[PDB]
Amino acid sequence: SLQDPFLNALRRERVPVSIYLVNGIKLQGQIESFDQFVILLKNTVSQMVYKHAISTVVPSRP
Amino acid sequence: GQSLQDPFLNALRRERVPVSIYLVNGIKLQGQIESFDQFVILLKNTVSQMVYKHAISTVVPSRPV
Amino acid sequence: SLQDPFLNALRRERVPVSIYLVNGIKLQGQIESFDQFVILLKNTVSQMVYKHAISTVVPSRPVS
Amino acid sequence: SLQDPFLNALRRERVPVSIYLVNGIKLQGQIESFDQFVILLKNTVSQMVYKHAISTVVPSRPVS
Amino acid sequence: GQSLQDPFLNALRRERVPVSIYLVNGIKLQGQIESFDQFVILLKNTVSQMVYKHAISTVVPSRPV
Amino acid sequence: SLQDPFLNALRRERVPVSIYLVNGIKLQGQIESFDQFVILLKNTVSQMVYKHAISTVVPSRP
RNA sequence: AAAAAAAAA
RNA sequence: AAAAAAAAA
């Protein structure tokens, strides 16, 4: 109830995100969709990102 | 809880798309999704191995689905 | 519980926090919000930190 | 489920397995036993591996 | 589920024993257990910080309890 | 039901164990006790080891 | 398989 | 905060 609103707003407004993984890798793209356990990150492809592997989701614009 | 994960993985299984599965440690695994359940994925390549989802960071399809 | 009351006070009182992640990365900012699984850390931008990736939440100055 | 049937067949048929851990360490042995959370890996000794620490279970040779 | 963890940590809290808490990444934290719940521990030293148990590998008491 | 019997037998027979953590650190000592989430490892002190941080528990003797 | 880097925005 | 070492018994 902070998580859903946050990820939906980035999905609607189609804002570019950086997704930092727990290993330090930075992923860039857009939240295409998400569910309870994964985020679909669109860029050149739609990859499935497991939330358990994510540290942070950073908006490029507030 | 399943409504994005199962469709995603079943599409890649039914259509036999080559995947990269990156692990939380950075290792890249490649093959095809033989099958899966709530906790693991069968990745077939030269051998068919069992991959724990808790160890996966991303499933990247090679072709655009 | 002890987690909510703790993060709430760092919130209400707008205290600068360090959030150390399980990989060692320190994150500076202020707690804007939180729920069961995530914290919103406010600095240049409002980013969402997953709790499972956090090792510690350290106040920069003591709480009162 | 797919996990039980898979580890059971590597067991019954006494197939050598590699168990790769989340930190990269490869473990050679045979599955002696398992439950919901742990696997017993048989080599020099019967050690207990936690599943949460496992990234993959790889057969050394294909199953039939 | 609690029958070893809570006694262990409450003893260290009530008796104010200096602890080392080693994190899963190898970092050593030192202080005293101010309090705790199911998911976190308050470690008081120069400042009182909140430590997630999922990030802890071991709690080592300095004195033999 | 493979986990409890395994850890109890090491506790009774007082067998020395190596406990390898997910970071590769090796702990040595004896299972003093355990519960659902932690193991008490006796050596010079009794430390509490979180099971989520353990990769393997290796008996020194079968 | 480093009895363990108060911690690589 | 390495768009990512088929993988340091």
DSSP state string for B43-58:
EESSSEEEEEGGGEEE
Q: Could you give the C-alpha distances from B44 to B5, E19, F56, in angstroms and in order?
A: 19, 47, 27
Say how many CB pairs under 8 Å bridge A and C. Answer: 51
Q: Which residues contact B7 (CB under 8 A, 6 or more apart)?
A: none
Which nucleotide in the DNA or RNA is closest to residue D47, CA to C1'? H9
Of F22, F35, F45, the CB nearest to E3: F35
Q: Distance between alpha carbon E42 and the CA centroid of its chain, in Å?
A: 7
**Residue B57 burial (C-beta neighbours within 10 Å; 0-12, 13-18, 19+):** buried
Instruction: Name beta bridge partners: E39.
Output: none
Residue D22 (CA) to nucleotide H5 (C1'), in angstroms, measures 14
d(CA F55, CA F42): 19
Q: Nearest to residue A7, comparing CAs of A54, B57, A43?
A: A54
For F43, the 3-state DSSP assignment is coil
The answer to whether D52 and D12 have CB atoms below 8 angstroms apart is no
Look at the block and give the residue holding tokens 């760092």. Answer: C10
Q: Encode D42-64: b = buried (16+ Cβ within 10 Å), e = exposed.
A: beeebbbbbbbbbbbbbbeeeee
Residue E19 (CA) to nucleotide G6 (C1'), in angstroms, measures 13
Look at the block and give the residue holding tokens 């798309």. Answer: B17
d(CA F5, CA A38): 36
d(CA C4, CA C35): 8
d(CA B47, CA B57): 21
Q: Distance between alpha carbon F29 and the CA centroid of its chain, in Å?
A: 8
One-letter-per-residue 3-state SS of E1-65: CCCCHHHHHHHHHHCCCCEEEEECCCCEEEEEEEEECCCEEEEECCCEEEEEHHHEEEEEECCCC
* B55:D3 CB<8 A: no
Query: Amino acid identity of C26?
Result: K
Q: How big is the CA angle at E22 (ends E59 and C64), to the nearest 5 degrees?
A: 85
d(CA E37, CA A44): 44
Q: Which domains does chain B have, with CATH numbers?
A: 1-65 (2.30.30.100)
Look at the block and give the residue holding tokens 């104010």. Answer: E16
Cβ of D23: how many Cβ atoms within 10 Å?
Answer: 15
The answer to whether E50 and E4 have CB atoms below 8 angstroms apart is no
Q: Chain H positions under 7 Å from a protein CB?
A: 1-9
Q: Say what the resolution is, in angstroms.
A: 2.4
Residues of F with CB under 8 A from a CB of E: 21-23, 25, 27, 33-38, 40-41, 45-50, 52-53
* F22:E26 CB<8 A: no
The answer to whether B14 and A47 have CB atoms below 8 angstroms apart is no
For B6, the 3-state DSSP assignment is helix
Structure-determination technique? X-ray
d(CA D17, CA A44): 36
CA dihedral sign of residues D39, F22, B44, A45: positive
Which nucleotide in the DNA or RNA is closest to residue C24, CA to C1'? G7
Look at the block and give the residue holding tokens 């050598």. Answer: D16
Residue A53 (CA) to nucleotide H6 (C1'), in angstroms, measures 20
The answer to whether A38 and B5 have CB atoms below 8 angstroms apart is yes
Read off the tokens for C30: 């202020």
Q: Note whether A touches B: 3 CB pairs or more under 8 A.
A: yes
Which nucleotide in the DNA or RNA is closest to residue A21, CA to C1'? H1
Look at the block and give the residue holding tokens 């030293």. Answer: E45
Query: Amino acid identity of B16?
Result: R
Q: What single DSSP character describes residue A1?
A: -
d(CA F41, CA F25): 14
A43 touches strand H (CB under 7 A): yes
For B24, the 3-state DSSP assignment is coil
d(CA E62, CA E60): 6
> DSSP string covering chain D, please?
--HHHHHHHHHHTT-EEEEEETTS-EEEEEEEEE-SSEEEEESSSEEEEEGGGEEEEEESS---
d(CA D12, CA B37): 22
Q: Nearest to residue B17, comparing CAs of B44, B57, B51, B53?
A: B44
Q: Could you give the C-alpha distances from A28 to A47, C19, D49, in angstroms and in order?
A: 11, 22, 35
Distance from CA of D61 to the nearest CA of F (A): 24
B35 phi, psi to nearest 5 deg: -165, -175
Which nucleotide in the DNA or RNA is closest to residue A24, CA to C1'? H1
* B36:D2 CB<8 A: yes
> DSSP string covering A7-61, please?
HHHHHHTT-EEEEEETTS-EEEEEEEEE-SSEEEEESSSEEEEEGGGEEEEEES-
Q: What single DSSP character describes residue C51?
A: G
Residues of C with CB under 8 A from a CB of E: 1-3, 6-7, 22-24, 51-52, 54-59, 61-63
For B41, the 3-state DSSP assignment is strand
Of E56, E57, E64, the CB nearest to F45: E64
Look at the block and give the residue holding tokens 């164990």. Answer: F17
